[PDB]
């Protein structure tokens, strides 16, 4: 039983504005073109082994079901772009999912593992940073012990930290700069 009181008329409009200006108003507004054909769900590799149904995410978005932001299902999409490539209505599905995930992150629905990945980029400038084993391996292969990457450049690490603070990404993930860890 879904009553008008359990629905949010503005969900589609709120998803569209979160997507403005990146990836774009025209990109995310494409969800309004969806005619629930199912081509996206049928093309979904994740959907073949889970309860995840791409078409329902878009339906929930249009109907006004805010639970779609609290769902674990939107996080099962790998961004393979198959649905994006096959949609006969030009819905930029993959981009709409990513945008819905931005609103999910802002509501506090972000996984600890993801926050950790994001913490590594903030801390070392890289999601998969170099180790003691990296240096030893690179040495034995004939490559420079430390790659010319942000991990070993304070200028670049500081540049990133300034942009992260300006974008409020640190607050989004819940990172404490003095403790150097997530809250």
């Amino acid at each position: 039983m879904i009553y008008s009181s359990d629905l949010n008329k503005n969900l589609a409009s709120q998803i569209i504005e979160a997507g403005t200006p990146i990836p774009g108003d025209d990109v995310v507004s494409s969800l309004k073109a969806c005619y629930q054909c199912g081509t996206c769900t049928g093309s979904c590799p994740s959907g073949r082994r889970t309860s995840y149904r791409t078409r329902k995410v878009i339906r929930k978005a249009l109907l006004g079901m805010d639970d779609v932001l609290d769902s674990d299902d939107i996080w099962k999409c790998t961004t393979c772009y198959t649905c994006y490539e096959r949609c006969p209505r030009d819905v930029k599905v993959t981009e709409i999912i990513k945008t819905i995930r931005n609103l999910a992150a802002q509501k506090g629905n972000m996984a600890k593992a993801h926050k950790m990945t994001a913490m590594y980029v903030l801390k070392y400038g890289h999601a998969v940073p170099a180790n003691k084993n990296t240096a030893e391996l690179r040495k034995s292969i004939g490559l420079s012990e430390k790659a010319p990457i942000a991990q070993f450049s304070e200028k670049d690490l500081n540049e990133m930290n300034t942009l992260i603070k300006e974008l409020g990404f640190d607050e989004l993930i819940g990172f404490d700069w003095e403790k150097g860890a997530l809250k």
């Binding site: 994740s46 082994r49 198959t82 992150a105 993801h114 400038g125 990457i149 990133m160 300034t162 974008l167």
Partner: protein
């Protein structure tokens, strides 16, 4: 050809043999790879783009600015980094509101993207600018084995901006691997995702492994001796994922995994020690016996 070689994360810090393999292979093809000093995570497009689109583009533009300052275009051997920087470059050229937002952020670090950077994937660069004929001319050790070619998703898609032809029935990689004397075996759901993308490997590991397992099973049923990719993320998922598949499903395959640069390296007579196959979670020795 001169290109700023974007390294990413996984290749330079984990599977370093792919970096070494690329540097020589590209040098043999006549490509001058210059260091993109201070470059960071692209950042991972599926993972970061899902957290905050504004953060994904701003940090990607910051990397694009490094090559722009150098007055050269970018080359990458990772689909993840290719997709992230390529889509970022296209969005900044096509959307002025996005460009304005990003440059207002980059002004705080004394940077400004001007849209002159072109992002290239080494496999399509080899196919469209160098030529497949040049690969065969440099083959010292023909690799007469069957290969389960994994194109990945971020290599050809989204086609509307990539313009690298069909994403449903591509030939690009198949023709590049076949030039080494190998055979690209046709297998079920060939163009399907490995399962690691969009932050799925990290948050939903068993779900990612289920897709990787389907791909490995299909390749083995098609008679493949190994799998070749153009993506360190796919590489890790296929290689490390097999240990995880054994520990979570009880399925063992010991199916060799190679990155195209490593495959082209072997073909061009490189020392397997320099390709760092020893760090691979799954032994490549069975494949090395076949060649």
């Amino acid at each position: 050809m001169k290109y700023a070689f974007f390294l990413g994360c996984i290749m330079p810090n984990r599977y370093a043999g792919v970096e070494a393999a690329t540097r020589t292979v590209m040098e043999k093809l006549g490509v001058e790879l210059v260091d993109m000093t201070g470059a960071s995570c692209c950042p991972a497009p599926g993972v970061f783009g899902s957290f905050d689109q504004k953060t994904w583009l701003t940090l990607a533009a910051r990397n694009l600015c490094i090559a722009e300052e150098m007055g050269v275009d970018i080359v990458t051997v990772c689909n993840g980094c290719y997709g992230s920087l390529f889509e970022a470059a296209h969005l900044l050229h096509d959307n002025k509101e996005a460009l304005n937002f990003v440059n207002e952020k980059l002004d705080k670090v004394g940077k400004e993207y001007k849209g002159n950077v072109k992002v290239r994937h080494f496999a399509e660069l080899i196919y469209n600018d160098i030529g497949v004929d040049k690969i065969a001319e440099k083959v010292e050790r023909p690799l007469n084995i069957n290969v389960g070619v994994h194109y990945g998703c971020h290599f050809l898609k989204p086609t509307d901006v990539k313009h690298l032809g069909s994403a449903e029935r591509p030939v690009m990689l198949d023709e590049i691997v076949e030039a080494t004397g190998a055979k690209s075996v046709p297998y079920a759901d060939k163009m399907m995702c490995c399962g690691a993308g969009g932050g799925v490997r990290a948050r939903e590991l068993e779900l990612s492994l289920d897709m990787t397992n389907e791909k490995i099973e299909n390749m083995i049923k098609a008679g493949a001796d190994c799998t070749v990719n153009v993506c360190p993320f796919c590489h890790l998922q296929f290689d490390r994922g097999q240990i995880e598949i054994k520990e979570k499903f009880g399925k063992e395959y010991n199916f060799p995994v190679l990155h195209l640069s490593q495959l082209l390296g072997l073909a061009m007579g490189m020392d397997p020690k320099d390709l760092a196959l020893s760090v691979h979670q799954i032994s490549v020795d069975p494949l090395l016996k076949k060649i």
